[PDB]
Amino acid sequence: MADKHLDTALVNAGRRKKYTQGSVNSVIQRASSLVFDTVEAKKHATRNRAKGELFYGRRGTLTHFSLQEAMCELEGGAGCALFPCGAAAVANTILAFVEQGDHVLMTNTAYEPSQDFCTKILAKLGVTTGWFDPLIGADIANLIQPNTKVVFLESPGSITMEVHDVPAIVAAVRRVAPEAIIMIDNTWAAGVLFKALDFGIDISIQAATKYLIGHSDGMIGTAVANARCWEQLCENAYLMGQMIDADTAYMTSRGLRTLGVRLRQHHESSLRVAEWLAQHPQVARVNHPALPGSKGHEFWKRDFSGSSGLFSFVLNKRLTDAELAAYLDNFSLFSMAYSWGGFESLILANQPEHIAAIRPEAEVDFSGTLIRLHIGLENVDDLLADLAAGFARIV
Amino acid sequence: MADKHLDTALVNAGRRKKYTQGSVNSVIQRASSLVFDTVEAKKHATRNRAKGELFYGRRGTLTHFSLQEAMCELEGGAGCALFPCGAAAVANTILAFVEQGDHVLMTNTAYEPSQDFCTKILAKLGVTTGWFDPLIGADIANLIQPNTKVVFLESPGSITMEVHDVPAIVAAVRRVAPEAIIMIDNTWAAGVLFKALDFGIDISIQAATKYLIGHSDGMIGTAVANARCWEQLCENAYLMGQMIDADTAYMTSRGLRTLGVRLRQHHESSLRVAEWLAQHPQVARVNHPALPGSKGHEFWKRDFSGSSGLFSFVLNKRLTDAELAAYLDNFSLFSMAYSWGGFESLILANQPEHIAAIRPEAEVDFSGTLIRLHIGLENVDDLLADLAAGFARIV
Amino acid sequence: HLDTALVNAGRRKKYTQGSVNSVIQRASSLVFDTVEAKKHATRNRAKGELFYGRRGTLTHFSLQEAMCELEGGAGCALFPCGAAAVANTILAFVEQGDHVLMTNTAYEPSQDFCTKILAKLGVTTGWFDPLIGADIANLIQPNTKVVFLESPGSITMEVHDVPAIVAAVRRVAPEAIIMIDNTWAAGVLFKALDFGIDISIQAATKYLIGHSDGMIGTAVANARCWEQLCENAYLMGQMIDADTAYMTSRGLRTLGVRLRQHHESSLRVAEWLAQHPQVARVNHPALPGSKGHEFWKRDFSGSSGLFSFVLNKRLTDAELAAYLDNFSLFSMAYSWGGFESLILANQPEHIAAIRPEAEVDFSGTLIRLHIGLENVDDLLADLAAGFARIV
Amino acid sequence: HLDTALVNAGRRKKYTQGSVNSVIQRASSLVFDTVEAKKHATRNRAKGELFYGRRGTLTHFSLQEAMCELEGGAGCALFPCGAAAVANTILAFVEQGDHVLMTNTAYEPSQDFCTKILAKLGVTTGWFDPLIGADIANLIQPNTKVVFLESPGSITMEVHDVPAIVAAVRRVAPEAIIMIDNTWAAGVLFKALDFGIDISIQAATKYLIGHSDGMIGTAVANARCWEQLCENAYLMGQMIDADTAYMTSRGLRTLGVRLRQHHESSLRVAEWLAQHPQVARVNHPALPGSKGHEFWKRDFSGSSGLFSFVLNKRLTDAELAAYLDNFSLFSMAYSWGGFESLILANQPEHIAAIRPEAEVDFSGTLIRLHIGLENVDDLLADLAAGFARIV
């Protein structure tokens, strides 16, 4: 990504004359009803209603088709399904491939809403879920059951940032259960720093809410599938009514155009911050995929073409409630909020016992408060000064 | 509705200073991340994350909260869940209340995507679906099984327009299965011409895509629940990631403001067209809830406060493929498209055997082509002239 | 029929591309595939070929076509708001040494453009009473270039006798540019160009947008005046954004149903006020006895919802607050044309100050109402509660 | 630091209401709860209190604060596009009998506003070479009111010596209004007001929007000039819609990262072109030897991506088509400032026609490039393929 290999593709993806009609960007076609001039046109649209002919707004307008083409090009897929947000993409992509009696095997570092979908929705529909440590690698083979239908990856993991050995996991799954559907939540890589479908994963899911939108002001999920899995994903998600509005689709395409320049800055700035934290006396551990020594760093170095700006670190103590407020309430530049992927730097704390509660069948291996940072586009020296002032409030 | 009882409420619904901030309409707050100024604010927002405190964009921003308040006021509910479209609202509202082993009882005149969700998604998750004639009334009692969890109504029915006797259905359900969840797709009434929750229905679902948006350019679903069912609907829909974007929420609130004036014109114009069709030698039957003699008209007259503009009629013959094109391809004012509820008049044909295929366990009682009209805001004499020219093409 | 025309205006496949409404094409840069395509676009840069976003995109072209159809014009120029349309449409037709005649009931920003901008640029403005009719001929000077009408007038609602004014202007100065601010009629209740007016200007902000949430001006010109309007407004950089253009087209579709309700409700309110013991006068074009009512009935095809009335006394400051601060449905705000009912007050001397070279003929406090889409009986109850606070 | 300021500019809780970005408040009417609130809003109608949508809503106020911070001004007026900002900012400060001095490299619509609009309103315009520096003093007349700069110049990219120009103006006419079209620098690579310029104008359409899909003008004035700019632009009805204001604020947030890439890529392309046998001259402010390069290096903190070069021959019409019609990555279009690379050609006489009272000093065909965000080696390959089509 630092060699800027993808910048031309990002500028051009999805932009064909039939969508752009003379402008640089696609038109925004807001529609439910899509008009058929003739019965013959209606027949053709019906036959091709999932193949990019205008049929009905739930299937998409020109604006959606342009984004779908862009996502398929950038992630190397056969089709791209769109959803109201990342969590809708995760829940509905899993649901599209399960039936009563099936089993899902999910990394224990999966985003908490993804886990809760499995334990609170799937379980009562007769679909069981089991868990694996993110560094399990080839030893995942022993956890695959005869009814395992879906293997769900997330690399780096949520909050704690562990990087999977995807080649080892995929090879083991294909040896034991070649027909399984392997999915990944590939949001941290923005789908482009880790080419999931080139690794033999079947479906790459993103919260496009994060880096694709890139400005903290739009929510949208995507799922890019290979040819084997596309039709089932497309049609079963459609039966759940999943779609995104045309305007957000436009804004997602628009975010792609600056994604390379943004990601390079997030990488540079966040790694500098991580390197400083890693030498700091008030820091016990830094979890940054690009930082040597972080969990799965060797796999990040081998398998990814760059880093984004989200990472975490563990303080040298667990902050009490009072210390947590003294720390978090008084930052000048970092904002406290959920989500990430924008221009604004963000800070979010989790206590060790909070993380343990969202690591099913596992324990945490740290005792300090875990601080997750999203490093935005501000000057990195200003961000470091803000972090230093925070440390002085809790020293 | 013709007495304009609701016009003031429609103008004012959801408009409180905290949402409007000095303007007439609510602000549009586009957000994923929502910032917590302090740990105390984060705690309060977390506790109240489903109760209208800013927490995270998936739960909503000020713009969503304003629409939700408006919908609860207008439909008399405890809460309103928002979805990417009507079909998402139907599928996810049903899903929110079922588990493996349950049974759904659905009118055989339900919108086809609603039926297909049941037969193609629910069945493989261990949830069975049975069917009932829309005029079954009190005799629905005999179809309720010990595992019937959901009774799903749609009045008027899709395409064929049959009106249920909701009081008789509800009373029978409550006598046999008082805990059942009774739902209705109340799109044709725009949630306001039929006050479903006052009839003892638990959840009123709409494709807000239709009359609430009112302009054929925005897609959104709503589900307004009573206090008994709200928390389950809210939390289970949230686990599926269901939401709508802030801009569409704004446009839905904005559509409410003209809904009364629009519906009165749709009623006037469509009933005039229906009355003319009912005397026409090339028409076998008119299906309009407001037309005396139409199926369930007596229930429409008793239970509804007005009509919208969607209805259908049966031609005196089945048009061949060639005649269908001669008829439909040459209208000057009616456009051929799916959906309805806008300012534009629309025409859509279904052959009798097409309808039979979407009437599970039932047959049709007509043999001519079924023409569905959405009567928009054009001058009714111009619409009549367009229909007359169409008749001359097939006489 | 107007309702059918409103639904269909501007909607051609090259703009709608399969949807009911036009696409929204957001653009500055518009791409030319070849040198020849660039030459063709340049030739057609004001004629609906994509050239540069300042001229417009498909979305603008669709709105412009709609406005030309509905108002019977050769072209429609777009502006950021109504005040920009007024100021720039007048400016487009004047130069040092010219004279503008303007009704003394013109919207106050229109007047202030003339006195604060035009005068120092060598363009003089004279004033006339809105009921002058044929006697305007006596005010036409050798250098009169523009005659600027506004019917009904701002706030006080006087309706011109447009046929008499136009005939008198054409007898003296047939080449003069006659303009009207036709906002109250939404350009459709009064077909200005059919009366021989050259340019019909609107604050599309009002009833065309219809929801109090978008600002835009329009000016529809006949064939004689279009090229000068188009090019001189373009030299001032005047345009509207594509999204507001889309919303204006969208507003047209419900304009008929909305206006009929505004007419029905506002005439009922006016008739009730006229009977009320605390009301001295009602200024509503549709109310019998109102100034120029006979021209409204003859020349218009309906009414909108904006009008005013004069109280039977001059409110003190305490009474003004007791009255205005405690309404339940009417909101105090500027503008009008939306679904929300609005109220504003003016003392007589406030109006006299914006009636150049004239005095007012009333002494009570003037109340301007915009009658929105609420139930009229609820609005009447709100007005009655207001009367009780000041009786 | 600029990057931190860009991320944070204009973002205060009263505009953001809990989100990262400002709310979008779409409004004409703004409601007053009481008479007192209306009086307060009226007093503060240009000072960030909600009064009427033509003045702005929260969304506009947030952008205005951001622009004032970033450009170091007392106020920021908003306009429908850059050309509207130029025309209306000049118009705000002139009257019959005044004189404008303008660089002969000004954007052509700016010149045409002066010759086609101002002249007939009694305001004369004289011209100067962009490298005139201190010798501009000899052109200042007793009636010179405005001095209008554009650095770098349009198309040909000449950089003024702003310190020398400003000092010379202030020696003769210290009260003159010095304005600059600061679009190329995005208002942030050249801190115009810190140099003693009174008003910095931008086509925010370019790098502030940054995506070729939104049009808007800005003008940031010092304390001495703000009230006249604000009020006179308002009398012309100048405003931008709330949504475009939001998108402009949003564009600011990535402006630093974008500009650094445009600088890196465009300087690499310029350096390569300068070595190329088919290139006579490169006009890039950052390239050594370019006109006024020493002032760019001294006075600016970076470069953007727009520049031009002169071919070693005058292309025939056939060669122009062979060259321009067959690019794979560069698009032919007007405007610039986005992620897309753009190309346009001008013959020398086309430029001479827009250099008033001057001739050009080249005879080859001039090519203007906007260098976008594509990989620079891909752009170089596209340029090389173009050279091969005309060698």
Ligand SMILES: Cc1ncc(COP(=O)(O)O)c(CNC(=O)C(=O)O)c1O
């Ligand atoms: C890896 C991942 N996958 C999916 C989602 C859900 O995406 P949506 O919020 O539904 O668009 C998120 C959201 N993350 C957050 O809010 C947070 O980490 O604080 C995510 O991190």
Ligand SMILES: Cc1ncc(COP(=O)(O)O)c(CNC(=O)C(=O)O)c1O
């Ligand atoms: C009664 C009803 N319920 C739900 C929906 C789905 O709503 P969405 O399209 O997903 O927003 C529709 C849509 N109707 C159509 O398109 C049509 O009848 O042609 C409907 O009629």
Ligand SMILES: Cc1ncc(COP(=O)(O)O)c(CNC(=O)C(=O)O)c1O
């Ligand atoms: C007749 C007329 N012409 C033009 C405009 C200006 O339109 P813009 O506000 O610039 O879009 C208005 C606005 N009216 C108001 O605000 C008000 O009467 O309180 C108007 O009444």
Ligand SMILES: Cc1ncc(COP(=O)(O)O)c(CNC(=O)C(=O)O)c1O
């Ligand atoms: C220096 C400068 N100043 C103002 C404007 C006008 O800005 P607007 O187009 O009205 O927003 C432009 C536009 N440039 C172009 O289109 C082009 O160079 O091809 C400009 O370069």
